[PDB]
UniProtKB/Swiss-Prot annotation:
GO terms for biological process: mRNA splicing, via spliceosome; positive regulation of viral genome replication; protein folding; regulation of DNA-templated transcription. It comes from Homo sapiens (Human). It is found in: Nucleus. The keyword Ligase does not apply. Its main location: nucleus. Found in all the examined tissues including heart, brain, placenta, lung, liver, skeletal muscle, kidney and pancreas. One of its GO terms (molecular function) is poly(A) binding. Belongs to the cyclophilin-type PPIase family. PPIase E subfamily. Enzyme activity is inhibited by cyclosporin A. This is Peptidyl-prolyl cis-trans isomerase E. Its EC number is 5.2.1.8. It is an enzyme of class 5 (isomerase).
Length: 173
């Protein structure tokens, strides 16, 4: 009822422990922008904690293209075709407020408008041609170094050179 300008709502921090080949490679830490995209952020956060009975743990980065991005999140079919959200098989594009301004951003993979599930990518470049098409919803705050090691397993085509796996994942406090 009353005119206001609301405070930024609290932003969850999440993490992913990464395994390359079958060798711990370390932890990526991510800030999720609930302040801009709370529906998209809550999905990803749940999928990190496994609190709904399903999520990213044990899934892989199945498509890694260097100088571009690392894509992952298929925990249902484990072949790059699957995934689901906490809201259902797919959900809407919340908004496109955040842009693909540079490396180390989290954005949702999709197969057209309003087809988000669980599959996401981490940028390795300014991928601004994806602005308005993929919902950006977070950023890496630690372990850019670990993401580079994921990127170094990429091919031009996308097939990874070694298995890259989310061995464990979660939310900070």
């Amino acid at each position: 009822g009353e005119p206001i300008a609301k405070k930024a709502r609290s932003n969850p921090q999440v993490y992913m422990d990464i395994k390359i080949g079958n060798k711990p490679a370390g932890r990526i830490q991510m800030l999720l922008r609930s302040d801009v995209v709370p529906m998209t952020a809550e999905n990803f956060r749940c999928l990190c904690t496994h609190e709904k009975g399903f999520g990213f743990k044990g899934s892989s980065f199945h498509r890694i293209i260097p100088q571009f991005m690392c894509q992952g999140g298929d925990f249902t079919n484990h072949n790059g075709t699957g995934g689901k959200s906490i809201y259902g098989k797919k959900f809407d594009d919340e908004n496109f407020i955040l842009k693909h301004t540079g490396p180390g951003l989290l954005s949702m993979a999709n197969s057209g408008p309003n087809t988000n599930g669980s599959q996401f990518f981490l940028t390795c470049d300014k991928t601004d041609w994806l602005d308005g098409k993929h919902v950006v919803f977070g950023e890496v705050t630690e372990g850019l170094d670990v993401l580079r090691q994921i990127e170094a397993q990429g091919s031009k085509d996308g097939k990874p050179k070694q298995k890259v796996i989310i061995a464990d994942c979660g939310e900070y406090v």
